[PDB]
A paper describes a structure:
After fitting and real-space refinement of the model into our cubic cryo-EM density map, the side chains for the E2o model fit the density well. The unambiguous identification of the cubic complex as OGDC is further reflected in the low presence of BCKDC components in the mass spectrometry data. For E2o, the backbones of residues 220–455 are fully traceable. The longer βC–βD turn in E2o enables an electrostatic interaction between the negatively charged surface of the turn and the positively charged surfaces of the N-terminus that is not present in E2p. Notably, in bovine E2o, the delocalized π-electron network is extended within the threefold axis and encompasses Phe253, Phe383, and Tyr419. In E2o, H2 has a length of 18 residues (Ser259–His276) and is comprised of a helix–kink–helix with the kink starting at residue 268. The H2 kink in E2o positions the C-terminal end of the helix more closely against H7* for hydrogen bonds between Lys275 and His276 with Asp454* and Asp454*, respectively. In contrast, the E2o knob has an additional hydrophobic surface on the opposite side of the knob, and the E2o socket contains two pockets to accommodate this difference. The exterior of the E2o socket is more charged than that of E2p, which leads to the greater number of hydrogen bonds at the E2o intertrimer interface. The E2o cryo-EM density map also contains a putative lipoyl moiety density.
The α-keto acid dehydrogenase complex family catalyzes the essential oxidative decarboxylation of α-keto acids to yield acyl-CoA and NADH. PDC, OGDC, and BCKDC are each comprised of multiple copies of a substrate-specific dihydrolipoamide acetyltransferase (E2p), dihydrolipoamide succinyltransferase (E2o), or dihydrolipoamide acyltransferase (E2b) inner catalytic (IC) core surrounded by multiple copies of the respective α-keto acid dehydrogenase (E1p, E1o, or E1b) and universal dihydrolipoamide dehydrogenase (E3) components. Here, we report the cryo-electron microscopy structures of the endogenous cubic 2-oxoglutarate dehydrogenase complex (OGDC) and icosahedral pyruvate dehydrogenase complex (PDC) cores from bovine kidney determined at resolutions of 3.5 Å and 3.8 Å, respectively. In addition, despite sharing a similar monomeric fold, OGDC and PDC E2 cores have distinct interdomain and intertrimer interactions, which suggests a means of modulating self-assembly to mitigate heterologous binding between mismatched E2 species.
Residue numbers in the entry:
A (entry chain F), B (entry chain E), C (entry chain D): 220 to 455
The structure:
Amino acid sequence: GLRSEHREKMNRMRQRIAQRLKEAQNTCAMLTTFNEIDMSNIQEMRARHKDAFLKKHNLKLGFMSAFVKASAFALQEQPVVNAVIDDATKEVVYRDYIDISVAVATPRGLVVPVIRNVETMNYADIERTISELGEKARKNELAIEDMDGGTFTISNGGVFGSLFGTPIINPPQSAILGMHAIVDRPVVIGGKVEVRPMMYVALTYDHRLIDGREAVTFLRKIKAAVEDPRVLLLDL
Amino acid sequence: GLRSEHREKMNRMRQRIAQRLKEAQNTCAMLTTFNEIDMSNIQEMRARHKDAFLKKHNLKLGFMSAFVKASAFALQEQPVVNAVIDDATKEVVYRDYIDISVAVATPRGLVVPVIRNVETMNYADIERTISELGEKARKNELAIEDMDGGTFTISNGGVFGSLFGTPIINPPQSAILGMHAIVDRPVVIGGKVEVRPMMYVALTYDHRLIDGREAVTFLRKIKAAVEDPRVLLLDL
Amino acid sequence: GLRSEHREKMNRMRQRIAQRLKEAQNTCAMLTTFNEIDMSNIQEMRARHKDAFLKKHNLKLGFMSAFVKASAFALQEQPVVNAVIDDATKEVVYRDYIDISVAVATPRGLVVPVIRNVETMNYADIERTISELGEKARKNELAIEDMDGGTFTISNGGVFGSLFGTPIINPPQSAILGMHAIVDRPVVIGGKVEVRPMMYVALTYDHRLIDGREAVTFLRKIKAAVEDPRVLLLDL
């Protein structure tokens, strides 16, 4: 055999990132709750609205916008999940606005832009902002003010094939949604086993501020808004 | 868009609750292990003993009592899981008695009464105590001595539709059982795919005191006692 | 009812173990990601190569060696997962060698020997080392130098029937693989529901050093190497 232990020194900013990551766990009391979403409806919608959508808006219709809009609706329903707890003053600051940070992928790494005031956006606007920030961040010119102060987060581990896992809360928030890969699985529809494209979804919430019942109902609201997008119009 | 950050100050007791919650994680070394329970037998039992049980005892036959009794049996089998570790004296205090705290739901919130000395109770007694405490706590007159000093806990996230998640240990204990919603899922019975009502069950245990093998065997014991209630009579 | 709280004092070494266990969580930023592995191929291989393998090597062909070799291949593919982070000097020490610690079961308890330089071993060598250490540790004569300094770990909760759970990183490492019990489950093969022997696999990684994408790809690499062992020969 052989032995060798070459090494590299940790730079300043990576050390800062590690310290911040540990502070995130040492500040919040994190727990996770899982659920499954039937992705048939979104796939069926996009597989026929993609062509006309591409012609109209010069954009590709992914399913990220549906999740972003559903999460925005769920947050609007339950303000507490949109709030954050500040220990420096012993105050639970609420927020009337809602902006969401979505992770984008670059060969150099992954970064998290922010979508400002998502409550007034359609699917087209969300997709356009996502594409604009994904091409703007592909080149390194992404400034701090486009990454600062998200209230809620959506993490994408699905594109790499994970089944389900526990994400970690980005410091200045109270929750994070972690999506995962879509897999064909057998499910029971109307008392009969059937094959559908399903995906597990995991939510991590700060148990100090958000009760377990609140987190579970919030996740079920996201599920309801993603399975049948027409729920968004009914304000149901 | 618009921005507004109205806020509310955290009261004394909620701050104390948050501090206690963080102390719970900073004291124990928590891990989780999951399993699945086939709920066919309990449903079939209650769907035909409900009427005569209601006439005899003036009570509704839920499946909470079955889980409470099965957990009591499992705890009696493995004393270590019923013990707690005291850092203030460096002693692992065992307990010959067994009392279990079960979470009840109220519109104002959720609270956790205690069932004293569950080892000598039938299903009828457990159901009667649960109903009595659920109606007594519906009105606010629930005193401290009815909530102090549980050795083991059963958490109910199922009624809200969660699939599975990781609960957090109530401070003065070594484990907690978290039930979840019952869903019809395809399973393999005798080499053939079949549809049954299943439910995921999660156990969180303090890894300092309880070994992984012990936790897994304890969870399997609960599964065995809940799938086939006649195991309780055999002392098997 | 009755009450009694006899107790036993925690000895020195068990207290040290608990302190080390808590230090493990307070040092690393741990997260978990899960996946499922189709175990048909390994079962089919061993169910017909077992007899000739037993005659040739006087050994029983388990599936532990396949997992050990697949994990070694995955580690060799991604050096960062094999590295560890040292806070005492602010350096990320890499390792050109690879040794793996595998948990063995004894009636007195469970212990974790080490397999040195697994990158140059076949299935036969890994099985022989596992058997030798399992019989050597059955008797208490297992020295420290046979347990010190593993770079990666494989934990066995399957033999006790667990479905899936979150293991805890052994201090001087950056990841741990936790296997679980094999269960027959319905899966979709070529658009049609089918019954196969499956098993959930969980990876716990230190989020300070290993990115989520890296962990997910590493787990998928293990899955690819275990489902089709011929991937090992192709260096694919």
